[PDB]
Amino acid sequence: KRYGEKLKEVFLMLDNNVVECIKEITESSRNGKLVFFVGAGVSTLSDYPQWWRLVDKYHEELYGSPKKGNYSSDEYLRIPQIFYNVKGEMAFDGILKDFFQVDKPTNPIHDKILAMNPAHVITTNYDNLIDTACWKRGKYFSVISAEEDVANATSSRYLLKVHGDFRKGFKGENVVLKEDDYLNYDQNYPLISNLMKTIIATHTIVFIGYGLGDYNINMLLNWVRKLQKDSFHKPFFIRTDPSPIENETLIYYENKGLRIIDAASLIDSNEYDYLERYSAVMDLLIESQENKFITKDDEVIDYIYGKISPLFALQYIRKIDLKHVFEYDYHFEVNGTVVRHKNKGFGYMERFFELKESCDERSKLSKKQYERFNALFNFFEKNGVICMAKDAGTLNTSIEINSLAYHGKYDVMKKFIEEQSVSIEDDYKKAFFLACLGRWEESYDLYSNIILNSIDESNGCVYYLSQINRYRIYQSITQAVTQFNGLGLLTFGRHYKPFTDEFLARIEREMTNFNIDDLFNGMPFEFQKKYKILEFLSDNQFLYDDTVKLFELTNKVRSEMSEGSYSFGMSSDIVVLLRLYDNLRFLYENCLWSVSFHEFHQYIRNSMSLLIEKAEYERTRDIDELGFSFFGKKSGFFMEYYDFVNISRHFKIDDIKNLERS
Amino acid sequence: KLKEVFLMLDNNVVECIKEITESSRNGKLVFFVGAGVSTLSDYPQWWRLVDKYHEELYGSPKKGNYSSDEYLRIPQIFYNVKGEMAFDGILKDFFQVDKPTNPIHDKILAMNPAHVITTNYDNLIDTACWKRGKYFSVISAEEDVANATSSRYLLKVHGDFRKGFKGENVVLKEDDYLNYDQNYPLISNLMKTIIATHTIVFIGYGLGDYNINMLLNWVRKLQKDSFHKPFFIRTDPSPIENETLIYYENKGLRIIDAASLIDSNEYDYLERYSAVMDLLIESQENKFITKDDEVIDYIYGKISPLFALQYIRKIDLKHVFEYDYHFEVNGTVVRHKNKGFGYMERFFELKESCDERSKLSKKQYERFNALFNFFEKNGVICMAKDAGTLNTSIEINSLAYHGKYDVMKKFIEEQSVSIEDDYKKAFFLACLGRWEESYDLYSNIILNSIDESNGCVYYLSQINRYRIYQSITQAVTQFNGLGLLTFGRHYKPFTDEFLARIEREMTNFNIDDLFNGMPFEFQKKYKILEFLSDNQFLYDDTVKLFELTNKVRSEMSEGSYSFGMSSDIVVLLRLYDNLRFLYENCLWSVSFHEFHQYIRNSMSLLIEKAEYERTRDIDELGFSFFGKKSGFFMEYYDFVNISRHFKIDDIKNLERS
Ligand SMILES: NC(=O)c1ccc[n+]([C@@H]2O[C@H](COP(=O)([O-])OP(=O)(O)OC[C@H]3O[C@@H](n4cnc5c(N)ncnc54)[C@H](O)[C@@H]3O)[C@@H](O)[C@H]2O)c1
Ligand SMILES: NC(=O)c1ccc[n+]([C@@H]2O[C@H](COP(=O)([O-])OP(=O)(O)OC[C@H]3O[C@@H](n4cnc5c(N)ncnc54)[C@H](O)[C@@H]3O)[C@@H](O)[C@H]2O)c1
């Protein structure tokens, strides 16, 4: 608690450089492209026998007593080999076994490194501690200690254990410890050597547990020396030695390709408080990831703008989608009021609403922030966002859909189609209108053209939506052809051929072995991060949770005793109606063809029928409980133009008769 | 016609085709695309330019086959003597030209390759990609590796002229090849890491290619049998001899000579390409069930992982076989969306006939026995058309269902011997009133399941622990706020430290990603369990109940009287199947409120239908002797269900109605 503030004090103290390091690392963490090269120090915390202690065992067994001290890199690798060569190989394995067979505990740092959502973890350790913490937390990684495993992996995420491991047996052949092990590494570990390097090239590397004079750190530095300048992202280093890095050192290693983050300088601790140093440099990143470090109105404005700007390409956003956009930090209700939800940090949305309420506070902001605030205000007013539920009141709700297709303006749609397009969005709307009028070959051609142009235009959204709509158009064409060939000729009295053989053959040939499941995955990770809410558009079926939620309308105990638990003092009727309206508006305003499928019609029918049945039952129970004059002819369900058109479009004669007689 | 080709395909060919297809359905195939593919699109073959340099340098063509040396030297002699400008001039002239995406390009992208490494300077693979609508990050220069934005890559290992038709952006002359790893260290490694972790299928190269031969000399060094032998799609007119087939096969390759697959004239290239490319590999994407033993092996492969569980819902089986057949609640099997050999019908025929079972070879009768036992226990009887007199029975062996609390206490007290006993003990503790002990035991099981296993018990323990934590949180919420008034005292079932610890431990846990984070092998083997992590477990049954309620109430209003089987039997069958599945697998989902509501609705509809069918014996039997006898009557299981899943208000309402 007090330290929490001290962590923030450290955070305040962080020079721009440490903040930048933390910044890129935290962004990388989120992108899914961080890797941690975890060395020995992170396990000396768990007391895993340090190496000098084993090099020392060998010195004492070999010659007779411990060395002077300061084993260099050479002695680190040669005393093990001398013993191996002179005292034996089966003894070498016994010394190892005695020290390394001891099961140690798992440190706090092991879960922090894993808390940052590391894409992979490279490690020059034989211990199975990263590999146990992984399991405790549930993070499944593919451990690669041996060459044989490089190809027999399962996940793309990896626990690359360079320098082997004792999973197969405590023998110095299953690990890299002595001089020859390190000398012939490339020859004896070709695939693991490469896997480490490709990962270093692509993902961001944050070293933790190594010295700057470590053998491995300086080996990688010589490889990176070869790499082309700016062909690689510089790796970060976490120096947890117990003192400030001599500025000279900082520079040399900085130029060699490191970006040190000395903990000794970021906090103050005793000479032997190694864990403290780790936690300091490690916590700044963890908290920073959570965006807990934020105080200014400009900061929350920038955060919300960065989160919201990509959605401007759309026309309407469902209230449920906003929950996923903000990562469950807030609940977005159909009523338009938003509430806090598992948010441990600054109330940025509270600040945004407070700014909206008061003009002077808005004037306090800068000019660019003022423009961003204006844009966000416009977007929120369009999508229907109100202040917090605490500050709520007699909020109203009206349904309005801006779409010529919904209102059946066939003449206006044809006139628009006949016009000359000016933008790709106009082409998308034209294709949707063509599909709505039954002209499906023209819609397919226009969607193909839009797909061809968007990829070059860098319009990922239109590209994705056009691909989905083209697939749906192809499916509709296929089912229509099957129906016409199966029964169309009989009922019509004559065989009808709306589509020529050449077009059918061409579409069959072009869309062969097509898979809509992998469409979203292949898009760049930037798009997947910005527009994740659209993933559900690629699923085979949807609107299942909404259908399941209809059970509440079938409840009977509510009439005897109802608490209005749904939302805040709202019945399930209003919630379901607003959910249906939101779904309808989102589908119709975004020009999506999925409206024309059986599932949507069935969902609409079920919702409307259950709502009307609940209204009738409520009226009957009200009449029964009180006198007949009380609600004798009261109508618990009120209809409007939108309900009329919905019923007309989505109900059959049998459904209407069943509703009327029910 | 390809049927004959298929028939002819030797075991070798079909084995190659099998692995290539299967790797693709997993997402691990990679195509090494060479020059030939682009010559199908009449792109200047290299020797055309080697010969252009050999003419502007010397004065004529080499009138001979360019060796591996002259391919790389003639370009360099010209560069060293005629300069960079002209070198790049001929480059612009021959290569600044548009050519069409040949058919083989699309075939390749139809295999949905994970990556496409290529030694081509052209952009034909890239165009086919955009046209197909398949994205790939193109890496053709060192810098591109660090700035890529996708997992998939179009690694152009010899550069491309996308940055201009200069020779500085490509590998063609000799110095470029000699200093390759020095100049392209990142792309060199990337290719090699993919080769190691993906199945490579070369296409567009000859066995004597410089590149093919260099890769093979590196695989020699791998020297740990840690590499998947790369397939090589030969497509030269003549048939590959045997001496070479042996030598190059030993050197690391798996040749698939198209000449052997299909006969052709000396210059029929797109023909040899297509046959091996799609008319075989792509056309063989399906199964090859043609023997009495392959049926048993396939069924055992699809059914073995389910042995870890105790019972399987019949409806869920629809997803096990990928919609190949419809499984009905009454135990009947119907064909649906299956165009290949009928293997379940063959299995049923073998079950009926003992001689067919005797025909099975050794080591396969035990698998048939296990499958027969599993199907008999699950209740699958036979195919629909051969249906006999189906029967209905109820049997739940779960101890907690019958409310034998003392027996569960004794079981908990007794020592455990296997993690299954620990799971049962955790379920018993949850059903007895110990949330802390159940949580601790679930955590213990999660910790101790590190050893090799199917990963099922670990996943179920995680889900159960999450649900138990949710129940603990709700209990605390209604204790600290309402427990004071309910009992008049501040009841403290759990200490603050335990609550804080459990809150801290899973503050980052997200049930949504629990299934995705599991190994890929588990996902393709135990996919049915995914629905256990959301309300999708109870979607189809609820819709069916709604439809049946609507139909039954419509018939009630009409007043018709059928003389056949009751139309609400499916509701009872689904209800009992769901109860058995949830109770025999020791799952906490039995405690959910939506499950209680569904049970209440189903039994209320059943009771209403029974009450209506009770009174019909006075109208239909009063005007004519013709009538019916079938009905519904109370029993122990229904009594327990009602006592557990109904409130006093619902029972009073049913009594009134
Ligand atoms: N060969 C030797 O130099 C030698 C000989 C005898 C004793 N020691 C002892 O070993 C200790 C560490 O030296 P080293 O061999 O690891 O090389 P080192 O000090 O270069 O270690 C590099 C990294 O290991 C981490 N680390 C070191 N000791 C740690 C600890 N106790 N807990 C957590 N992290 C730790 C540090 O954060 C550092 O970043 C020294 O304090 C020294 O007393 C070293
Ligand atoms: N040796 C030369 O440099 C040279 C000189 C002049 C003419 N040619 C002519 O060019 C042809 C191929 O020359 P190469 O040295 O590249 O052969 P190659 O064997 O090196 O070709 C490599 C791969 O490309 C394939 N391939 C060859 N021609 C193809 C085509 N037109 N379409 C599709 N795939 C094709 C081959 O089957 C082989 O698998 C020869 O038939 C020859 O008549 C070659």
XYZ file of N, CA, C and O in Angstrom, chain B residues 472-595:
496
model
N -18.631 -18.963 -3.978
C -18.131 -18.389 -2.732
C -18.368 -16.886 -2.708
O -18.788 -16.323 -1.690
N -18.082 -16.211 -3.823
C -18.265 -14.765 -3.879
C -19.731 -14.394 -3.694
O -20.062 -13.474 -2.937
N -20.631 -15.110 -4.375
C -22.055 -14.827 -4.221
C -22.522 -15.107 -2.796
O -23.321 -14.347 -2.231
N -22.036 -16.199 -2.200
C -22.401 -16.520 -0.826
C -21.945 -15.429 0.129
O -22.695 -15.024 1.020
N -20.718 -14.934 -0.044
C -20.227 -13.855 0.810
C -21.066 -12.600 0.607
O -21.396 -11.891 1.569
N -21.422 -12.303 -0.645
C -22.224 -11.116 -0.923
C -23.572 -11.187 -0.219
O -24.030 -10.195 0.361
N -24.224 -12.350 -0.255
C -25.516 -12.495 0.409
C -25.390 -12.786 1.901
O -26.409 -12.799 2.600
N -24.179 -13.028 2.401
C -23.956 -13.226 3.828
C -23.699 -11.907 4.546
O -24.346 -11.607 5.554
N -22.766 -11.115 4.026
C -22.398 -9.865 4.681
C -23.478 -8.806 4.554
O -23.511 -7.879 5.363
N -24.367 -8.935 3.566
C -25.405 -7.949 3.336
C -26.778 -8.425 3.763
O -27.593 -7.634 4.249
N -27.044 -9.719 3.589
C -28.328 -10.316 3.931
C -28.232 -11.383 5.011
O -29.227 -11.637 5.694
N -27.067 -12.010 5.189
C -26.932 -13.014 6.229
C -27.141 -12.454 7.621
O -27.533 -13.183 8.537
N -26.882 -11.157 7.803
C -27.110 -10.530 9.101
C -28.580 -10.575 9.492
O -28.907 -10.835 10.655
N -29.480 -10.321 8.541
C -30.912 -10.349 8.812
C -31.485 -11.759 8.747
O -32.439 -12.072 9.468
N -30.924 -12.617 7.894
C -31.461 -13.967 7.745
C -31.347 -14.753 9.045
O -32.277 -15.476 9.425
N -30.217 -14.623 9.743
C -29.977 -15.343 10.985
C -29.820 -14.440 12.200
O -29.782 -14.954 13.324
N -29.729 -13.125 12.017
C -29.570 -12.211 13.127
C -28.157 -12.075 13.649
O -27.949 -11.357 14.636
N -27.181 -12.735 13.027
C -25.801 -12.698 13.483
C -24.875 -12.600 12.280
O -25.196 -13.076 11.188
N -23.717 -11.977 12.494
C -22.709 -11.816 11.447
C -21.988 -13.145 11.270
O -20.958 -13.411 11.891
N -22.537 -13.994 10.405
C -21.932 -15.287 10.127
C -20.695 -15.103 9.258
O -20.753 -14.452 8.209
N -19.578 -15.680 9.697
C -18.307 -15.563 8.992
C -17.844 -16.939 8.530
O -16.904 -17.504 9.104
N -18.475 -17.511 7.501
C -18.058 -18.850 7.053
C -16.608 -18.918 6.614
O -15.962 -19.955 6.807
N -16.074 -17.845 6.030
C -14.703 -17.811 5.539
C -13.975 -16.612 6.125
O -14.552 -15.529 6.264
N -12.706 -16.814 6.466
C -11.888 -15.730 6.982
C -11.505 -14.769 5.859
O -11.596 -15.085 4.670
N -11.074 -13.570 6.258
C -10.692 -12.558 5.279
C -9.479 -13.000 4.469
O -9.398 -12.735 3.264
N -8.518 -13.662 5.119
C -7.289 -14.043 4.429
C -7.570 -15.001 3.277
O -7.012 -14.845 2.184
N -8.430 -15.997 3.498
C -8.740 -16.950 2.437
C -9.431 -16.262 1.265
O -9.111 -16.529 0.099
N -10.384 -15.374 1.557
C -11.081 -14.657 0.495
C -10.113 -13.800 -0.308
O -10.157 -13.786 -1.544
N -9.220 -13.083 0.380
C -8.239 -12.260 -0.319
C -7.315 -13.118 -1.173
O -6.982 -12.747 -2.305
N -6.891 -14.270 -0.649
C -6.002 -15.145 -1.405
C -6.677 -15.645 -2.676
O -6.083 -15.614 -3.761
N -7.926 -16.106 -2.565
C -8.608 -16.629 -3.747
C -8.878 -15.510 -4.744
O -8.804 -15.717 -5.962
N -9.196 -14.307 -4.255
C -9.394 -13.180 -5.161
C -8.108 -12.847 -5.906
O -8.129 -12.590 -7.116
N -6.976 -12.846 -5.199
C -5.701 -12.528 -5.834
C -5.302 -13.587 -6.852
O -4.807 -13.257 -7.936
N -5.506 -14.866 -6.523
C -4.955 -15.935 -7.350
C -5.532 -15.917 -8.761
O -4.790 -16.045 -9.742
N -6.851 -15.755 -8.887
C -7.520 -15.807 -10.183
C -8.051 -14.446 -10.619
O -9.021 -14.379 -11.382
N -7.437 -13.356 -10.152
C -7.840 -12.032 -10.611
C -7.604 -11.853 -12.105
O -8.264 -11.016 -12.730
N -6.702 -12.651 -12.682
C -6.411 -12.573 -14.111
C -7.069 -13.715 -14.891
O -7.095 -13.687 -16.120
N -7.612 -14.714 -14.195
C -8.204 -15.858 -14.875
C -9.378 -15.419 -15.742
O -10.199 -14.593 -15.335
N -9.447 -15.990 -16.952
C -10.543 -15.697 -17.869
C -11.013 -17.013 -18.466
O -10.278 -17.654 -19.219
N -12.230 -17.422 -18.137
C -12.772 -18.689 -18.615
C -12.908 -18.704 -20.131
O -12.914 -19.780 -20.740
N -13.019 -17.533 -20.762
C -13.196 -17.487 -22.210
C -11.999 -18.089 -22.936
O -12.162 -18.817 -23.922
N -10.789 -17.798 -22.465
C -9.566 -18.255 -23.111
C -9.047 -19.573 -22.550
O -7.968 -20.017 -22.954
N -9.780 -20.208 -21.631
C -9.295 -21.447 -21.033
C -9.135 -22.541 -22.082
O -8.120 -23.247 -22.104
N -10.126 -22.699 -22.962
C -10.049 -23.747 -23.974
C -9.000 -23.427 -25.031
O -8.273 -24.319 -25.483
N -8.912 -22.163 -25.430
C -7.987 -21.783 -26.490
C -6.542 -22.006 -26.076
O -5.715 -22.389 -26.902
N -6.233 -21.783 -24.800
C -4.873 -21.935 -24.318
C -4.394 -23.364 -24.187
O -3.198 -23.586 -23.979
N -5.296 -24.335 -24.307
C -4.923 -25.732 -24.183
C -4.170 -26.179 -25.436
O -4.224 -25.513 -26.473
N -3.450 -27.302 -25.367
C -2.701 -27.762 -26.543
C -3.617 -28.028 -27.728
O -4.791 -28.372 -27.573
N -3.058 -27.858 -28.929
C -3.839 -28.067 -30.145
C -4.372 -29.492 -30.221
O -5.493 -29.717 -30.691
N -3.588 -30.470 -29.763
C -4.053 -31.853 -29.799
C -5.309 -32.030 -28.956
O -6.240 -32.740 -29.356
N -5.357 -31.392 -27.785
C -6.540 -31.486 -26.937
C -7.745 -30.836 -27.604
O -8.869 -31.340 -27.500
N -7.531 -29.711 -28.292
C -8.641 -29.002 -28.918
C -9.317 -29.857 -29.983
O -10.550 -29.895 -30.070
N -8.529 -30.553 -30.803
C -9.077 -31.394 -31.860
C -9.595 -32.732 -31.345
O -10.246 -33.456 -32.106
N -9.329 -33.074 -30.084
C -9.738 -34.350 -29.513
C -10.886 -34.237 -28.523
O -11.695 -35.163 -28.431
N -10.978 -33.134 -27.784
C -12.005 -32.928 -26.764
C -12.731 -31.610 -27.002
O -12.949 -30.814 -26.087
N -13.117 -31.364 -28.255
C -13.785 -30.112 -28.594
C -15.168 -30.002 -27.963
O -15.600 -28.889 -27.643
N -15.860 -31.126 -27.765
C -17.216 -31.082 -27.223
C -17.238 -30.403 -25.860
O -18.248 -29.802 -25.474
N -16.138 -30.482 -25.109
C -16.086 -29.886 -23.779
C -16.070 -28.364 -23.811
O -16.340 -27.741 -22.777
N -15.775 -27.751 -24.962
C -15.733 -26.292 -25.029
C -17.060 -25.685 -24.594
O -17.087 -24.697 -23.849
N -18.173 -26.278 -25.028
C -19.490 -25.761 -24.681
C -19.743 -25.770 -23.181
O -20.651 -25.069 -22.722
N -18.970 -26.534 -22.412
C -19.094 -26.548 -20.961
C -18.601 -25.259 -20.314
O -18.822 -25.068 -19.112
N -17.951 -24.375 -21.072
C -17.423 -23.128 -20.532
C -18.317 -21.930 -20.834
O -17.843 -20.789 -20.781
N -19.589 -22.152 -21.149
C -20.515 -21.064 -21.441
C -21.932 -21.630 -21.460
O -22.148 -22.817 -21.187
N -22.913 -20.789 -21.793
C -24.309 -21.224 -21.829
C -24.654 -21.999 -23.095
O -25.777 -22.481 -23.232
N -23.713 -22.112 -24.030
C -23.965 -22.885 -25.239
C -24.225 -24.357 -24.949
O -24.766 -25.054 -25.813
N -23.853 -24.840 -23.761
C -24.168 -26.212 -23.381
C -25.670 -26.470 -23.399
O -26.093 -27.620 -23.570
N -26.487 -25.427 -23.232
C -27.931 -25.603 -23.111
C -28.675 -24.719 -24.109
O -29.596 -23.983 -23.739
N -28.280 -24.780 -25.382
C -28.928 -24.010 -26.440
C -29.915 -24.840 -27.252
O -31.094 -24.484 -27.343
N -29.457 -25.943 -27.850
C -30.334 -26.743 -28.699
C -31.496 -27.325 -27.905
O -32.643 -27.321 -28.373
N -31.221 -27.831 -26.701
C -32.278 -28.435 -25.896
C -33.349 -27.413 -25.541
O -34.544 -27.727 -25.551
N -32.941 -26.184 -25.222
C -33.909 -25.156 -24.853
C -34.794 -24.773 -26.034
O -36.010 -24.605 -25.880
N -34.203 -24.627 -27.222
C -34.992 -24.316 -28.412
C -35.958 -25.454 -28.715
O -37.124 -25.226 -29.071
N -35.486 -26.696 -28.592
C -36.360 -27.844 -28.809
C -37.513 -27.844 -27.813
O -38.660 -28.128 -28.180
N -37.228 -27.533 -26.547
C -38.284 -27.468 -25.543
C -39.296 -26.383 -25.882
O -40.505 -26.590 -25.743
N -38.821 -25.216 -26.322
C -39.735 -24.146 -26.712
C -40.646 -24.597 -27.848
O -41.870 -24.410 -27.796
N -40.060 -25.195 -28.888
C -40.855 -25.622 -30.036
C -41.866 -26.690 -29.637
O -43.028 -26.645 -30.065
N -41.447 -27.658 -28.820
C -42.360 -28.716 -28.406
C -43.469 -28.173 -27.515
O -44.615 -28.621 -27.607
N -43.152 -27.213 -26.644
C -44.187 -26.591 -25.825
C -45.207 -25.878 -26.702
O -46.419 -25.991 -26.485
N -44.725 -25.174 -27.723
C -45.622 -24.479 -28.633
C -46.522 -25.471 -29.345
O -47.723 -25.253 -29.440
N -45.945 -26.556 -29.855
C -46.725 -27.557 -30.579
C -47.754 -28.215 -29.666
O -48.912 -28.417 -30.054
N -47.347 -28.562 -28.444
C -48.245 -29.250 -27.526
C -49.390 -28.337 -27.114
O -50.539 -28.776 -27.011
N -49.105 -27.055 -26.875
C -50.173 -26.135 -26.500
C -51.110 -25.865 -27.673
O -52.322 -25.706 -27.483
N -50.574 -25.819 -28.896
C -51.437 -25.692 -30.065
C -52.357 -26.899 -30.196
O -53.557 -26.752 -30.464
N -51.814 -28.105 -30.005
C -52.648 -29.302 -30.037
C -53.677 -29.281 -28.913
O -54.813 -29.738 -29.089
N -53.292 -28.758 -27.748
C -54.220 -28.647 -26.630
C -55.396 -27.752 -26.997
O -56.559 -28.100 -26.764
N -55.103 -26.586 -27.575
C -56.166 -25.677 -27.989
C -57.037 -26.310 -29.066
O -58.264 -26.159 -29.049
N -56.421 -27.021 -30.015
C -57.198 -27.702 -31.046
C -58.098 -28.772 -30.439
O -59.264 -28.908 -30.829
N -57.577 -29.539 -29.486
C -58.338 -30.605 -28.867
C -58.253 -31.942 -29.567
O -59.081 -32.819 -29.293
N -57.285 -32.129 -30.459
C -57.140 -33.388 -31.171
C -56.568 -34.464 -30.254
O -55.924 -34.171 -29.242
N -56.812 -35.720 -30.621
C -56.346 -36.877 -29.861
C -55.647 -37.837 -30.813
O -56.303 -38.493 -31.630
N -54.324 -37.919 -30.709
C -53.563 -38.874 -31.497
C -53.598 -40.251 -30.839
O -53.889 -40.393 -29.647
N -53.298 -41.275 -31.639
C -53.260 -42.657 -31.169
C -51.880 -43.279 -31.347
O -51.774 -44.489 -31.570
N -50.820 -42.472 -31.256
C -49.466 -42.938 -31.388
C -48.611 -42.592 -30.186
O -49.108 -42.349 -29.077
N -47.298 -42.562 -30.409
C -46.375 -42.253 -29.334
C -46.502 -40.808 -28.906
O -46.817 -39.938 -29.717
N -46.245 -40.546 -27.634
C -46.308 -39.188 -27.113
C -45.232 -38.322 -27.756
O -44.095 -38.754 -27.964
N -45.599 -37.081 -28.069
C -44.703 -36.149 -28.740
C -43.747 -35.446 -27.784
O -42.860 -34.721 -28.247
N -43.899 -35.639 -26.474
C -43.033 -35.016 -25.481
C -42.013 -35.990 -24.903
O -41.342 -35.658 -23.920
N -41.879 -37.184 -25.487
C -40.891 -38.140 -24.995
C -39.482 -37.598 -25.189
O -38.587 -37.869 -24.378
N -39.254 -36.839 -26.264
C -37.926 -36.290 -26.520
C -37.504 -35.365 -25.386
O -36.326 -35.313 -25.017
N -38.453 -34.614 -24.821
C -38.128 -33.731 -23.702
C -37.596 -34.544 -22.530
O -36.567 -34.210 -21.934
N -38.295 -35.628 -22.184
C -37.857 -36.471 -21.076
C -36.498 -37.095 -21.364
O -35.627 -37.143 -20.485
N -36.299 -37.583 -22.591
C -35.032 -38.216 -22.937
C -33.881 -37.223 -22.834
O -32.830 -37.533 -22.262
N -34.067 -36.016 -23.373
C -33.021 -35.001 -23.302
C -32.754 -34.589 -21.860
O -31.599 -34.410 -21.461
N -33.815 -34.433 -21.066
C -33.650 -34.048 -19.669
C -32.833 -35.086 -18.912
O -31.883 -34.746 -18.193
N -33.176 -36.364 -19.076
C -32.458 -37.406 -18.350
C -31.036 -37.565 -18.873
O -30.114 -37.831 -18.095
N -30.831 -37.399 -20.182
C -29.478 -37.462 -20.723
C -28.612 -36.349 -20.149
O -27.464 -36.586 -19.754
N -29.154 -35.134 -20.078
C -28.404 -34.016 -19.520
C -28.117 -34.237 -18.040
O -27.024 -33.935 -17.577
N -29.096 -34.747 -17.295
C -28.883 -35.022 -15.877
C -27.788 -36.061 -15.683
O -26.891 -35.891 -14.848
N -27.842 -37.150 -16.456
C -26.835 -38.198 -16.340
C -25.454 -37.671 -16.703
O -24.471 -37.951 -16.006
N -25.357 -36.896 -17.786
C -24.061 -36.372 -18.202
C -23.482 -35.438 -17.148
O -22.278 -35.479 -16.866
N -24.321 -34.588 -16.553
C -23.825 -33.612 -15.591
C -23.516 -34.236 -14.235
O -22.629 -33.745 -13.527
N -24.217 -35.305 -13.855
C -24.013 -35.900 -12.539
C -22.956 -36.995 -12.535
O -22.219 -37.125 -11.550
N -22.857 -37.786 -13.606
C -21.874 -38.861 -13.650
C -20.459 -38.354 -13.890
O -19.500 -39.072 -13.587
N -20.321 -37.122 -14.391
C -19.005 -36.532 -14.654
C -18.573 -35.607 -13.517
O -17.563 -34.919 -13.641
N -19.338 -35.556 -12.428
C -18.986 -34.765 -11.250
C -18.702 -33.311 -11.635
O -17.594 -32.795 -11.467
N -19.734 -32.659 -12.161
C -19.670 -31.265 -12.572
C -20.586 -30.430 -11.688
O -21.653 -30.893 -11.270
N -20.166 -29.198 -11.407
C -20.939 -28.300 -10.558
C -22.046 -27.575 -11.313
O -22.846 -26.871 -10.684
N -22.137 -27.754 -12.634
C -23.174 -27.081 -13.407
C -24.573 -27.475 -12.954
O -25.535 -26.762 -13.259
N -24.707 -28.593 -12.235
C -25.999 -28.994 -11.695
C -26.570 -27.939 -10.758
O -27.787 -27.889 -10.554
N -25.721 -27.091 -10.178
C -26.164 -26.085 -9.221
C -26.623 -24.789 -9.880
O -27.014 -23.859 -9.169
N -26.588 -24.703 -11.207
C -26.940 -23.463 -11.883
C -28.451 -23.249 -11.872
O -29.239 -24.197 -11.828
N -28.849 -21.975 -11.911
C -30.264 -21.624 -11.861
C -30.957 -21.870 -13.196
O -32.125 -22.275 -13.226
N -30.262 -21.621 -14.309
C -30.864 -21.851 -15.619
C -31.182 -23.327 -15.821
O -32.212 -23.676 -16.412
N -30.301 -24.210 -15.346
C -30.579 -25.640 -15.407
C -31.837 -25.982 -14.617
O -32.676 -26.768 -15.074
